[PDB]
């Protein structure tokens, strides 16, 4: 750029991990951030916090969107949040700061990284919807016109820019279960979806447009990061006292 080195790049450091950024972010908060006080009223057992593990920024997925598949409304990622369970077969894995415990709660922060060229144009919109999977109009609210009204961050492809979406804990429990309690009828005690606080929406606000050249890149990768401000666990059990069912995908 203008130095023997590149430009000076901003840094974000949490426990045992460092993230680098080069431009100005685009941020927003899901709801009023607070301090949980009724959670101690749900469990008699002492809560546990693991700052060194839970405060860490983790990379979970990277999706590629090309010009040919870039249309207004195109959903690049549509998954139930928070669910970051990755294993060899479709099967929470103990390989990272993840615990096989009955109950938990925490506030989340989502960072989206995109690295485009100086010569492309497009727009991505990353939004979040508290328990959208339980709404009778879920599949109807996936359109970017509806995403604009939900807490969301915007990504410009005509500028290289990062974005962070703060998502404070909001739920009806107020402790969400990490695993299943499957013994119930459909009329009473229906099956409980583990760790389903909401749905994270990223989509195409403006179709990814590239140069008409052959030697020009026609695909761009969208990487995501997730972190937890403060986590509490109150259900202590055997790692295999309860088991993990195959994640029920819910696409439109």
């Amino acid at each position: 750029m203008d130095r023997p080195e590149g430009s000076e790049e901003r840094t974000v450091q949490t426990s045992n991990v460092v993230l680098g950024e080069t431009n100005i972010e685009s941020q927003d908060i899901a709801s009023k951030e607070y301090s949980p006080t009724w959670d101690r009223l749900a469990s008699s057992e002492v809560s546990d916090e693991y700052p060194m593990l839970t405060d860490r920024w983790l990379f979970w997925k990277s999706v590629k969107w090309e010009v040919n598949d870039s249309a207004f409304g195109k959903m690049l990622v549509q998954e139930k949040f928070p669910q970051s369970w990755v294993q060899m077969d479709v099967n929470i894995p103990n390989f990272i700061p993840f615990n096989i415990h009955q109950y938990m709660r925490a506030d989340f922060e989502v960072k989206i990284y995109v690295n485009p060229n100086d010569f492309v144009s497009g727009w991505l919109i990353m939004a979040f919807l508290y328990q959208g999977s339980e709404m009778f109009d879920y599949k109807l609210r996936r359109n970017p016109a509806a995403l604009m009204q939900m807490p969301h961050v915007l990504v410009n492809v005509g500028a290289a820019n990062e974005a962070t979406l703060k998502i404070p804990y909001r739920y009806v429990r107020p402790f969400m279960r990490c695993k299943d309690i499957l013994r119930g009828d459909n009329l009473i005690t229906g099956v409980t979806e583990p760790l389903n606080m909401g749905v994270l929406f990223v989509e195409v606000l403006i179709p990814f447009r590239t140069s008409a050249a052959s030697s020009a890149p026609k695909s761009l990768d969208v990487s995501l990061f997730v972190k937890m401000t403060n986590a509490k666990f109150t259900g202590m059990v055997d790692g295999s006292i309860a088991l993990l069912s195959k994640p029920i995908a819910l696409p439109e």
């Binding site: 508290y130 959208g132 109009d137 609210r141 009806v172 309690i181």
Partner: protein, 239 residues
Amino acid sequence: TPNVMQPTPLLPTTNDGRVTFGEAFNDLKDLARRYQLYWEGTILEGNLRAIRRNSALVQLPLYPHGLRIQPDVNNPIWNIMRDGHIPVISSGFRYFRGGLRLRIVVEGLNSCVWVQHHPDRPSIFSRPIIGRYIAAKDAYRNHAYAAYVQNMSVNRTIEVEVPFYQPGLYGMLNASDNNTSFDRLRFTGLGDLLIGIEGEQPIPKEGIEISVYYSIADDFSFNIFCGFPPMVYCDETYS
């Protein structure tokens, strides 16, 4: 880019003179509504069970977002113009924690009527069910539930306030209908309201008409703002 974000404003003029929402008019306009809107229709004799004693006539699920709209030709208030303000207001939010006020009008009877509230009953219905066609072990009056017994000879409109009794942090509104969880049956609705007639005496030939109006309460709150779902214009209900 928060939901309200203005990057570069090009404002050519000054702002409009401030009114208070109650000055050139005399009421304070904010988003709070205790305006009463309808919820059901009429019942006939042929609808009730063979033994209509301590058997409720209506099973009303309690939803802040109202019931699932069903258009009829007998009832144009649902068909030409969609449901009232309340369910369109609750459509932009996710959670609630208050109770509801119910005003109930029973016109074809001059005999006593009862109304009972079942908080812990799972709200798994999106439409009211009547008489014989009601699920058994339901529409049976219970003993130790909040209730109100009223004579139609004195007054034929019942006004009660249904409380918020959920074992959770919030109350979920805009709940899906058909296939579950543990958040859709005990954390969504305030429960069910049973409306029955004290006597087992047959229903008059003309039948009875029950109109249930409801409103929000004070301890009620729309907690988290969500995006608005796409709406339908009532003005285009003829083409």
